């Protein structure tokens, strides 16, 4: 016979404290972009991106990430 | 017979304290980008990126990452 | 007695010839300007300029400048 | 007695010839300008300029400058 | 008595010939300018310039400058 | 008595010939400029320049400069 007894006790306090978050600045792609193309012979799929893209400013006042997994496999 | 007894006790305090977070600056791609292309013969898939891209500013006032795994395998 | 005889003969051909003037480009102030000012105590006249200003494109298809002076002073 | 005889003969051909003037580019102030000022105590006149200014593109297809002076002074 | 006889003969051909003027580029102030000032106590006139300024592209397809002076002084 | 006889004969051909003027490039101030100033006590006039300035590209397809002077002084 199999007897399995499980007690994960977790009182964990993933805590943060800031008095003043601020005065944050993010200036991507300030300058000039210039592209000039002539006499191109493509013979397969193409992608192109030009400019400012995908520019993130994540400012999480908390930003307390917590991750938890319980796998319990039985054969 | 199999007897398994489990007591993970966790009171862990992943803590942070800041008086003043600030005056943070992020200036990617200040200067000028210039591209000039002539007489290119491509014969397979292409990708191109030009400019400021994928520029992150993560400013987590906490930023307390916690990660936890419990695998319990039985044969 | 005074005798003064004057014959400025001028057949001068200040000439220009262009087959095709073109494909001219002028891009001043491409990038970003940013100004930030705090706690300034001025006690006299002020001037300020910010940005793109006074940006000339002179494209004279001729542009044949000619200048001519005749002073004739008598005492 | 005074006798003065004057014959400036000028057939001068200040000439220019271009087949194709073109493909001219002028990109001043591509990048980013940034200014930050705090606690300044001025006690006399001020001037300030920021950015792209006074940026010339003179493209005279001729551009044949000619200058001529005749002073004739008599005492 | 004074006899003065004057014959400046000038057939001078200040000439230029270009087949193709072009593909000229002028990129001043590509990069980033940054200025940061604190606690300045001025007590006389001030001037300031920041950025791209006074950037010339003279492209005279001719550009044939000619200069001529005739002083004729009599006592 | 004074007799003065003057014959400046000038057939001078200040000439130029170019087949193709081109592919000229001028990139001043590519890099980054940075200035940081604290606790300055000026007590007389000031000037300041920062960045790309006064950057010339003269491309005269001719560029045939000619200069001529005739002083004729009489006592």
Swiss-Prot record, chains A, B, C, D, E, F:
Glycosylated residues, chain numbering: 43, 49, 65
Residue stretches of each Tau/MAP repeat: 2-32, 33-64
Outcome after substituting residue 1 to N: In FTD1; minimal parkinsonism; very early age of onset
Compartmental location: Cytoplasm, Cytosol; Cell membrane; Cytoplasm, Cytoskeleton; Cell projection, Axon
Tissue: Expressed in neurons. Isoform PNS-tau is expressed in the peripheral nervous system while the others are expressed in the central nervous system.
Site entry (Not glycated), positions: 7, 13, 17, 27, 36, 39, 66, 71
Leader sequence residues: none
Record-listed cross-link Glycyl lysine isopeptide (Lys-Gly) (interchain with G-Cter in ubiquitin), residues: 7, 13, 17, 27, 39, 43, 49, 65, 71
Residues with PTM N6,N6-dimethyllysine: 7
Result of changing residue 48 to L: In fatal respiratory hypoventilation; unusual apparent autosomal recessive inheritance; reduced binding to microtubules as well as increased fibrillization and aggregation
N6-acetyllysine: modified positions: 7, 13, 17, 27, 39, 43, 65
Omega-N-methylarginine: residues bearing it: 45
Phenotypic consequence of residue 16 to F: In PIDB; markedly reduced ability of tau to promote microtubule assembly
Post-translational modification: Phosphorylation at serine and threonine residues in S-P or T-P motifs by proline-directed protein kinases (PDPK1, CDK1, CDK5, GSK3, MAPK) (only 2-3 sites per protein in interphase, seven-fold increase in mitosis, and in the form associated with paired helical filaments (PHF-tau)), and at serine residues in K-X-G-S motifs by MAP/microtubule affinity-regulating kinase (MARK1, MARK2, MARK3 or MARK4), causing detachment from microtubules, and their disassembly. Phosphorylation decreases with age.
Phosphoserine sites (modified residues): 1, 20, 48, 52
Annotated disorder: In Alzheimer disease, the neuronal cytoskeleton in the brain is progressively disrupted and replaced by tangles of paired helical filaments (PHF) and straight filaments, mainly composed of hyperphosphorylated forms of TAU (PHF-TAU or AD P-TAU). O-GlcNAcylation is greatly reduced in Alzheimer disease brain cerebral cortex leading to an increase in TAU/MAPT phosphorylations. Frontotemporal dementia 1: A form of dementia characterized by pathologic finding of frontotemporal lobar degeneration, presenile dementia with behavioral changes, deterioration of cognitive capacities and loss of memory. In some cases, parkinsonian symptoms are prominent. Neuropathological changes include frontotemporal atrophy often associated with atrophy of the basal ganglia, substantia nigra, amygdala. In most cases, protein tau deposits are found in glial cells and/or neurons.
Reported function: Promotes microtubule assembly and stability, and might be involved in the establishment and maintenance of neuronal polarity. The C-terminus binds axonal microtubules while the N-terminus binds neural plasma membrane components, suggesting that tau functions as a linker protein between both. Axonal polarity is predetermined by TAU/MAPT localization (in the neuronal cell) in the domain of the cell body defined by the centrosome. The short isoforms allow plasticity of the cytoskeleton whereas the longer isoforms may preferentially play a role in its stabilization.
Subunit structure: Interacts with MARK1, MARK2, MARK3 and MARK4. Interacts with PSMC2 through SQSTM1. Interacts with SQSTM1 when polyubiquitinated. Interacts with FKBP4. Binds to CSNK1D. Interacts with SGK1. Interacts with PIN1. Interacts with LRRK2. Interacts with LRP1, leading to endocytosis; this interaction is reduced in the presence of LRPAP1/RAP.
Domain remarks: The tau/MAP repeat binds to tubulin. Type I isoforms contain 3 repeats while type II isoforms contain 4 repeats.
Protein name: Microtubule-associated protein tau
């Amino acid at each position: 016979s199999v007897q399995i007894v499980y007690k994960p006790v977790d009182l964990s306090k993933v805590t943060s404290k800031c008095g003043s978050l601020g005065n944050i600045h993010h200036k991507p792609g300030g300058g000039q972009v210039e592209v000039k193309s002539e006499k191109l012979d493509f013979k397969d799929r193409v992608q192109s991106k030009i400019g400012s893209l995908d520019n993130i400013t994540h400012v999480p006042g908390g930003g307390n990430k917590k991750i938890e997994t319980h796998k319990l496999t039985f054969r």
